[model samples]
Target: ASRLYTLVLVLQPQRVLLGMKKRGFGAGRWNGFGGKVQEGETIEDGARRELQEESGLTVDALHKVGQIVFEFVGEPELMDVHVFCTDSIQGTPVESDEMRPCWFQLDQIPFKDMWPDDSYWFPLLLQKKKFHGYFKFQGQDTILDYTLREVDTV
Candidate 1:
């Protein structure tokens, strides 16, 4: 019923890392680094690879903080998103052709430039709580309906 996708957010004490997507599915938006899980790789491996490619950082471990299903009104498939957070990374983030990495103070996150669904679940992540959600969207910018909850496990 859903396809696999991963999203990783790098947290550094009082700041969070975000990337400005340059092309493909979510182009022009600021988001975590990730994409579809490819063949021959585990989901966590896919997350690690995407984060490395997009942001030039390597995270050895990640906290699985959230799971979300994004349903677009006219789209046939759902994006089953696995969200991860990491407080430790190995390299300095460098911009790639696919993304430009940047850091924002925790309170200064630019929600207006991100997916509408992000604003709803990000707080839970910041609180170190696990969560699950489903967002029904009319298009990229509008959320038609949604369900979000803190979970004991994600």
Candidate 2:
């Protein structure tokens, strides 16, 4: 099975905003806000909507910076995650039932507490580089194999 998902990140001057997913597949880890693309909306539409729903910020424009494909050993569907980011957005990052918003400095990202695959492509986003990656996981801590590369267009 193939499912579509979106991730939106807000990059500030010196800090990156992330949310601790309170429930769902990525619960208990810091990450960019996002969710599944519904039947009636476009992928970016879902990205912006998920960001606002989860963190209270609205993005007028999102940079299509990268994409990461995540597959777990036991999950049936493959997650084709569309990743977007922006340096500009509106409203405050507020906590919701789905997430707890927080900010991290450039050099202090909580990779240890995020989806393991994030450690692979997240740095590329921060450096303003477009990239594509694939990561396979056994559970939470074991990455069996992966590949990452910068691309001119993702």
Candidate 3:
């Protein structure tokens, strides 16, 4: 079975919030806030939980925008990630033990410092288009190949 996770981007007028993972998986890189979906937990609920836990921001609504399946070379299982975005949220982002949250201007997104696959799908997310993607990673830094496209519905 594949493992389920969530990636959430909090959007504002001209900026978006992302987090630098401080420890554990994906540490040392900027990425959306998310984590593993617990057993019996709804995907959307898991997304909401991870957001507040990692960034201290609460969201009442989330737009389901995309999903991706990640296959790391030599890995035994797949990681299925659900992507979401929300423009409505409450509270300021405060750092947590696992992540340091920061806001970036829309035009200045730090794609080079994030997962390689992000650059492919982020533009779709920014454009508010639903999408689905698949990425094959040689390791943490290299994307062997990938396929991304817009969808009418996620």
Candidate 4:
């Protein structure tokens, strides 16, 4: 179903955190901890909730970094994703049914195994920069169309 989703990037000096998604929409993929936006609470809370629930970590200072609209070709579903980052997060990332947490050096991000659109914007976040983007995905690996730009704020 079409819905709002949240993705948080935990960035630390010379490293970044990610998880191997274990279930639901992005199962079997290595991505950030996130999920559909629920009632009442916004993406910030939802992102944090997903973080704690899926990775056992909490952000002390999360910042809005980017936003994107994903239009999947041939599907009735659309996703508005809010992207966030926290250089000041805390706790150990514990595994859950949804994700198995992992970290990688800055020079070695596993974008080849992540969503195709991710490779396009993850660097924006890693650069400690902000951006906004639109992506049209065919199947799961092909990007039929996309536009991305850096922003002063998000």
Candidate 5:
């Protein structure tokens, strides 16, 4: 399985936020929270590390949402996105050189400021439901799709 990382940061309504980056890969659009999985690091570990590094919050609880594999039509690297959800964390979000931390209301999420795929499954995840989705797109435009079972609250 190709490795990846993502974080769902639960925050108060209308917190201002910003996008983050390292060198070249993270320079696109602002996003929730995440990074690439490093070698010898567990996906969960990467998630925690990335959250702390990017948002300066310590994740208290994390749940595996599921995984997605996208076949890039032209990109060199195959994209395998591992989705995760966390409701447990400590400390307030702070800004880093890589990230410009901010927040928005449930209805005011900067969808246009984020990746195209977020609009599809983020709502389900926010409702504490697990979701697995695949999206093939060329820069915010959906090209194809598939999804699995919704997460049971039980």
Candidate 6:
């Protein structure tokens, strides 16, 4: 079985709030709210719980958006990334030990502070379109990739 990860794209009235992981290789970088799937937790349950735990918000609806796999020289891990879009949620975002929540205007997202590939597909998500993309990278640099041919409408 592949390892699973959940990503929540949270929307607000003025801007979109993304939770950045506070540690690890992607630490201090802006990414969707998410983490590894805990034991006995369903993918949806994990996604919902991670969002609330990292951002202090309750998601109203979450749809599966995409998945990706990562391969390295040694033991490769299949990173099954499930992306969800939440239009309705409650509570104000707070800084947590694992994440730092921040809001960015539609046109003013800080791409420089995010994973190089984020700038590519994140906008597609913001447009309310669902996409499945593969970001082949070594460290912070994007090496190769692919996306689902049919981008779903939300």
RMSD to truth, every model: 0.9, 1.1, 0.9, 1.5, 3.3, 2.3
lDDT by residue (tens digit), candidate 2, 1-154:
7799999989987999999988867789998888899999999889999888888998988889888888888999878999998889889889878888888999999999987778778888888899988888899789999999999998
Model 6 residue runs over 4 Å out of place are 72-75
lDDT of 2: 0.88
lDDT of 6 by residue, 30-106 (tens): 88788898999998999999888888888887876655555432337757787787878889888878888888897
Worst 10 residues of 3 by lDDT: 94-103
Spell out the clash pairs found in candidate 1.
Answer: none
Q: What is the lDDT of residue 11 in candidate 4?
A: 86
User: Which residue pairs clash within candidate 2?
Assistant: none
What's the distance in Å from true for residue 88, model 5? Answer: 3.0
Query: Which residue pairs does candidate 4 place in steric collision?
Result: none
Give per-residue CA lDDT, model 1, range 72-133, as digits (tens).
99899999999999999998999878888889999999999998889999988888889999
What does candidate 4's lDDT look like per residue over 5-89, in tens digits? 9988888898889999876777777888777889999779999998788888878867899998899888787898988888777
- Decide which is better by TM-score, 1 or 6: 1
Better of 2 and 5 by lDDT: 2
Predicted candidate 5 versus true structure: per-residue lDDT over 116-138, tens digit per residue: 67767766656667766676656
Deviation (Å) of 148 in candidate 1:
0.4
Tell me the whole-model lDDT of each prediction, alpha carbons only. Answer: 0.92, 0.88, 0.91, 0.85, 0.64, 0.75
Clashing pairs in 3: none
Q: What's the CA error at residue 90 for candidate 6, in Å?
A: 1.0
Model 5: which residue pairs collide? 15-103, 16-102, 16-103, 17-101, 17-102, 17-103, 18-100, 60-88
* Superposed Cα deviation of residue 125, candidate 6 (Å): 0.8
